Design a protein around this ligand. Sequence first.
Ligand SMILES: *[C@@H]1O[C@H](CO)[C@@H](O[C@@H]2O[C@H](CO)[C@@H](O)[C@H](O)[C@H]2NC(C)=O)[C@H](O)[C@H]1NC(C)=O
Ligand SMILES: *[C@@H]1O[C@H](CO)[C@@H](O)[C@H](O)[C@H]1NC(C)=O
Lengths: 129, 103, 562
Amino acid sequence: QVQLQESGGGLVQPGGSLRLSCAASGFTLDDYAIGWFRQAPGKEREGVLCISASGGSTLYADSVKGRFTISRDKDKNTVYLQMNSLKPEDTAVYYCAAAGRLDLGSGYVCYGYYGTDYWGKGTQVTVSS
Amino acid sequence: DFTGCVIAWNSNKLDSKPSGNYNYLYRLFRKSKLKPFERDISTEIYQAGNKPCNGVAGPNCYSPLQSYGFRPTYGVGHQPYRVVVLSFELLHAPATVCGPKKS
Amino acid sequence: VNLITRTQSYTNSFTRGVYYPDKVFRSSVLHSTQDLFLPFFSNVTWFHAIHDNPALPFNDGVYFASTEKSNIIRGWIFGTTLDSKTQSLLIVNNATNVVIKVCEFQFCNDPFLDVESEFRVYSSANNCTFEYVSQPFLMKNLREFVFKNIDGYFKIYSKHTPINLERDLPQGFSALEPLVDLPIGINITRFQTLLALHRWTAGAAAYYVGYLQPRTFLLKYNENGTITDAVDCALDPLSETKCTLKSFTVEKGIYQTSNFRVQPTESIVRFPNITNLCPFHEVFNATTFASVYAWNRKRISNCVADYSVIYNFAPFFAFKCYGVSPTKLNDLCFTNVYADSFVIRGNEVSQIAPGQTGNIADYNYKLPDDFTGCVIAWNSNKLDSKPSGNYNYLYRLFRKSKLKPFERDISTEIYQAGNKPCNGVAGPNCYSPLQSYGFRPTYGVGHQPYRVVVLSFELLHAPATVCGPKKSTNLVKNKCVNFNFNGLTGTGVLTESNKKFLPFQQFGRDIADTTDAVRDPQTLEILDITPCSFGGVSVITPGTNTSNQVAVLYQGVNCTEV
Ligand SMILES: *[C@@H]1O[C@H](CO)[C@@H](O[C@@H]2O[C@H](CO)[C@@H](O)[C@H](O)[C@H]2NC(C)=O)[C@H](O)[C@H]1NC(C)=O
Ligand SMILES: *[C@@H]1O[C@H](CO)[C@@H](O)[C@H](O)[C@H]1NC(C)=O
């Protein structure tokens, strides 16, 4: 019922701009924190960035701060990102993921990292360098 | 004044995972009780203090949505259960549902 | 865009709005029914709209009556908040159709149609939950509609009647007939009317709106089965007489209708005489903690416990209660309170839970599976850690059998895991089941020492002794009052007393074995109880064919209270 399909990617020169989106179909959880991950060949998969589903409390990573601009649209229930100023260190296999939020201490807190319920098929983003 | 049939079966074989199943949640706090056969999906930070919560779960700020914990090693009362209930509307309008009685 | 303005006048409803309550057929029968209706001579708010707060409340049910001919009145939108936070309906009634969309649609200022886009009504919502359609054949005259929602069921009644050239609602009656039912099932607290404005252009309209209430009516069916008369049962004493006698005419005489009572105003309650304060300061902080294998247990009773000050004694984050809630500990009254305090390792806090398994769970502290209480654990890295290494805290490692619930071990001996006896020497197959905890300020989070306090409560099995200090409602006097005194539900008038209750009586009854003199568990006072005054009502009328004037008499009551 819940499926995550991802579209976009390709090979571009360093410093270029790319738009990549993952669409969630059949999602039913009221509170959730969809996660985003990438894995270069020979390195472990790590989180990239995420925002809150309720209001859009944004969060980034140190390596991709500012460069990776994200926005979540509830109309199509999909996640959109603007990626500019590409460097060779960004060459990795990007996977889109969805997971439920944590309920501890009687609060609504969005968490990423590991422990993700669902994942996408992924794509390849290549920088010519 | 309930009239109808209830069928309950333990589903610990499919709703339990080794890591622990949090698929299901329940509301723990509510200002007023629920009318019969009414649900509640709206999610917000419950406020238990004079000061407004302002969307931050700090002091006197709670979440009225607690996740269940389902595991296959838990007790029988802690095992997940699947329930199907059938309720009937009796003859007040032209009846629509009944078995294959030959005219 | 705000471009519609409105004015309000008021009118009396006269006697309109009787609809066939059921799907049944009757003839020449005076029937009685209880349901939602528009009370006779109600206060209808005439709306005159020209071209605004069009968020008209819905309440239980709405009666909508119009007299316009241009068909400029069309559609009716219903909802609770009409925003993107709570689900809202989208009933949009047009020429010959009806459609429903129910989810968290947001709504603007003027819910109008451009004319035919409903974009000015809703924009978006999370994957909408439901969409429905239906197809009617909808069509100097008065058009009357009644909409109601019962048990998640929306029902509509209608009637088109001819009226001569007149300015207000007419006399006579008009039965209403049903058209449509559908189970939406939500809280609708407001609704909105809609019109047609062509681009725009000036517009004029007028209509009447009334709010239904639950009532009891008596209806008269003619020989043809059509309703031709109806009488309310809560309007005038003459109407009450008509309802009681089940007839439309009352002969000369005196009849009895019902009874009147003094409805008590407020409510009051009881609490016992507790003035002590429970000592939470000594338990939560004593500059020293007992070991986990020998946990310190204290009993607290015969005092008032203020659990709001617990946060100010220990630097923890939040409570962890199973049988009760952290915010619901100042209301329930318990018999005894048990507090068990110790210090454990950082990662073994997870083992402090009902039905836990582990070294601590079955060797140091065991808890019955039906635990009804709370557990508070918080770090102790600044007091229980030393640069050399703390060694004053020990935990049991080896035990022959798992610990029973609420059981401790204090005995120290040499554990034997071999066939040969230990003989008091820790040689081969001889161990010491007491391992000293290693606490350092450079250790990881899961290894930091943590103070743990488990509070266990006892339910109402004996006279309770621990609960919050709420007064017994500051005992009122000389008023008919509701009350729940110690589980006794009732009403009565409370006055002073002149009877000598002996030192330790709580309730004192009468010949009827019902209480008449009473004490107070918060202050030793003697009080008297009387029933609130009540009586019967009689109505004296001449013949109905003579006049409609009536006289009302209250039986056996002095002419001062009434
Ligand atoms: C019933 O209708 C009358 C109109 O006949 C309304 O007038 C209100 O009257 C009360 C008491 O005189 C005032 O306090 C309100 O301010 C009036 N409302 C206005 C001026 O808009 C009113 O809706 C009802 N009157 C009642 C219940 O006494
Ligand atoms: C409907 O909305 C009101 C308005 O906030 C809310 O108080 C209520 O709990 C909701 N449900 C019912 C059944 O009234």
